Symmetry: C3
Subunit: 410 residues, 3 copies
């Protein structure tokens, strides 16, 4: 549902900035769209043919950036919207990139691992002249992973020499960054610390409920727990657990790790996962699916803060119902941006030919997230708007300023 959410947010932000109508149309037209044939021999010799693609939306603020999806469902308009969302998101946290999105229309469960490698190399052979370290830097996405990126790196480097910075999300052995897996969860916590400091409160003052215990949910709960937060309720798709004292997340992660369901963790009480969103607590954090907060449950939300860790968790309905209940909402486009920020740091480390240790990675993540919250809050004063429009006007205005500085003559 990124399509309708990004278009509404762009439109509302554009109207706040008063963007000139002809600049807006240019900003909406992608820099370049590419489709290429990817034919490979299967392991038995016979042929399969797919179409690979790359939408390169904008590069006014620097090289394009975004994921590669190996997925059968390819809608050109959703891909355009995701690339465009990367352009705004990078500008919100002031990393020097524009947005792109690409992939191949295939089902990776139909392909062996040798076939996946051959497909990835042929894709790279078909697009290498269109990507690059200062041109367009791919990353994992639905259906791809760090091993995919190793194959892209290896094949790209035959055409342009050894180029570690041409992709992010690489394995550690080949130039990947430390702290990549925790970065989104940890960034969520850094961002909430900045928000709470605006009221002179800190994380150790609050109770939290967390919906989803995936990559973001586990790391976000770890970071809250180590900073003195009381996590009082944790949900995932199966079961859920609560504890008004605060759940021992350290123990809960160990329990999940040894193949344990939440519902049978001894350090809490089993609860219905459908009751998580309306749990009694200070802060709610959706980390699972989007659109879970609508107008049927919005008035029932007990939290006074919503940290949008998942993408698009609250719809327009709830956004207003909660806004007049006094609930402050920290928007997805900013709050979960620790991922793209550390992927930038990976690219920096490769460019500088010298890796950072993990303390340095987390030190800069915190600097970037804190500085972005202050820029957002400053915009909310200038335009007297909520934090979601502070964020979008910030990124949109930064892309517009760079576009206008660069000019239009040939």
């Amino acid at each position: 549902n990124a399509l309708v959410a990004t278009n509404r947010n762009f439109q509302r932000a554009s109207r706040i900035l008063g963007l000139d109508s002809k600049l807006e149309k240019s900003l909406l037209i992608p820099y370049r769209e590419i489709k290429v044939e990817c034919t490979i021999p299967k392991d038995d010799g016979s042929l399969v043919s797919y179409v690979g693609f790359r939408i390169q939306h904008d590069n006014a603020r620097g090289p394009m950036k975004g994921g590669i999806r190996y997925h059968p469902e390819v809608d050109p308009d959703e891909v355009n919207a995701l690339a465009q969302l990367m352009t705004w998101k990078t500008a919100v946290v002031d990393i020097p990139y524009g947005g792109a999105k690409g992939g191949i229309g295939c089902n990776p469960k139909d392909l062996s691992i040798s076939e996946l490698e051959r497909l990835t190399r042929v894709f790279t052979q078909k697009i290498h002249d269109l990507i690059g370290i200062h041109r367009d830097v791919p990353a994992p996405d639905m259906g791809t992973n760090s091993q995919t990126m190793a194959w892209i790196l290896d094949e790209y480097s035959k055409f342009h020499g050894h180029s570690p910075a041409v992709v992010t999300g690489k394995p550690i052995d080949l130039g990947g960054s430390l702290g990549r897996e925790a970065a989104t969860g940890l960034g969520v916590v850094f961002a909430t610390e900045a928000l709470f400091a605006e009221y002179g409160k800190s994380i150790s003052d609050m109770t939290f409920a967390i919906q989803g215990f995936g990559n973001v949910g586990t790391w976000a709960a770890k970071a809250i727990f180590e900073r003195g937060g009381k996590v009082v309720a944790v949900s995932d798709i199966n079961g859920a657990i609560s504890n008004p004292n605060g759940i021992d997340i350290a123990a809960l992660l160990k329990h999940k790790a040894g193949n344990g369901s939440l519902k049978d963790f001894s350090g809490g009480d089993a609860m219905n996962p459908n009751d998580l969103l309306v749990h009694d607590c200070d802060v709610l954090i959706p980390c699972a699916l989007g659109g879970v907060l609508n107008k049927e449950n919005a008035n029932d939300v007990k939290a006074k803060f919503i940290i949008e860790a998942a993408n698009h968790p609250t719809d327009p309905d709830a956004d207003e119902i909660l806004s007049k209940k006094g609930v402050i909402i920290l928007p997805d486009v900013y709050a979960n941006a620790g991922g793209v920020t550390v992927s930038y740091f990976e690219w920096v480390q490769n460019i500088q030919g010298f890796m950072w240790d993990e303390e340095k990675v987390n030190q800069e993540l915190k600097r970037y997230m804190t500085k972005a919250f202050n820029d957002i809050k400053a915009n909310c004063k200038t335009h007297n708007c909520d934090l979601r429009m502070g964020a979008f006007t910030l990124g949109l205005n930064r892309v517009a300023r760079a576009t206008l500085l660069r000019g239009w003559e040939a």
Copy 2:
């Protein structure tokens, strides 16, 4: 345009102090490459105008060439060659890894609409993109150009060689420009003055100051002096001048100037003839706006014991000798105002590293480079038994000669 005559004198004096071989000297004088190119554009009404762009690339033994782009009608080649050469010594004095270049277009930018300036800048870039580059020659603003010009150079250059933020410096902050660029020259003057006064066991707070000029350099230098307990007793704008025997609240004066206040109106002092600032009774004199201001007449009448040359070439040769025989220590322009090119190097470094620095780090590095440079100059003065000006020119000249001789001469 004393830059021609002054750069030539100083090179000759320094070369003799070093005893440079005459064949090496000849090579050092010949620029690496001189380029002129046709730049023709359609005006807003479609009619054609034709200009000649140029780039003098003087020397690259110590690294990529570096220098400004001038949109100015006067384009004497001997002067453009001298400016490029001066940049080769200046980068060497502060030990940043560049050589010298200078370029421009023979045009008057007041004849050109803003769209015509852009087309002209883009065509100029089309004609020289193969001659500049991150590790080859890095242009910068100068008379008639600014950060907008640099953005256009960047935008057009990147069409030919890919996104290349480091190909120009002086970029807008939004396109990879560095923090602390604007204060860099004035702030650097103060760092250099602190290092000079440490040789006497004195400090900026021990002194009173007269500052000539309230432009980019004068304002920031006065602010840095004032925040270090220095007493600024006289400031000279182009329009007026202001006085105070006990110090001018530079902070309030900055507020007055910002709200469009003429210097002679600032209530926290009283007026002064600006044509008399150079002979104010002060410990330190800092010319900032204009050069050529100290000649055979005013020389014996100067009061200060120190002259910090923030402006370019403010001291005539005649005045250099007369002031020296009066015991006046002159911190030379080629070093004193080098903060600008030094921070332009840091901008290039930040672009190269793909990761910007905060302003604290920029200024820490600026202080380290200016301080090390003064220590190296002072050491040369001790080695060669010369004043600070020859200390600087021998340091820079020697560094370029050493790099040249290391690289060698076989094909």
Copy 3:
């Protein structure tokens, strides 16, 4: 010499890791081997013709790296062995390079300084397309120096633009790094500090005997002395000096820069240089020749620690005898790796366009040597082997794992 040791170490390590024989065969085949004609006119105008060469062994972890030898004796077997050692060695200290080794079969004593410059520029003209800042980075070796690297830099840059990072060992004026002279000796001491910390001891608790007083011996002794170590015996080629309370290394370095032979030192008693290895100390540090620990003298060694600062000081019979006696041996491939680590830092500083101060160089040297020891020790625990196999399995496995991540499809 180096050939026999490297081959043995490789097989033992491969057997420990259980490397697949097909992978092993690939790992042993060099990526590329090059021979080029190098003809120049002599100062008198007549022609001499030489053969230049470059063995590029492996680049799965990054650009190849290694010395250029101007030497009449060209053994392709040992050239291959040295390039391959560089591949394992860089992996041991987690430096992002592979191994290469090159040279020109000539006697530099027959050539004037202008003829040497012409030979170096012509060699560069013949291999410029095969080397590069991210492809293969040469360095000094026997018969070449920093002036030689200056010529490679100047000629290479005519073809690919100003490229400071294409060679290391450059003059300081042309982008060379600080800290290079002390780097190997100081690295030896850093590595020895890390080992003793595992037993809860300090440098100040030990007595040391040091064989050899060249670049490595002088800096190693200087650094041991500063950290509180008692250097009770020092030998060179012409004699040796002893002092049970400790030799004043500072005063010994003064006497040596005054062209004073060791045995004429007033702050010690002259001993037989051939009794250094069996001198009564806690720690032996060979810094002169290889093979000086053989099956004859190995049983007489009284030190409980041997720090291999020289290349290949103990043959394998001595390894076995000293192990039974409880001697712990810090292996050469790790202990003396400070040289190649600082050369990496020179490349890093060039790539970043901004040089470091010597304090930062030595700070990073310490971080790298200390991390490598920790990685080595961890490996000794998994495979339950001595430190020497801990080091070779660590580096071998890093090259294997990078090779396997990159894959084999075209």
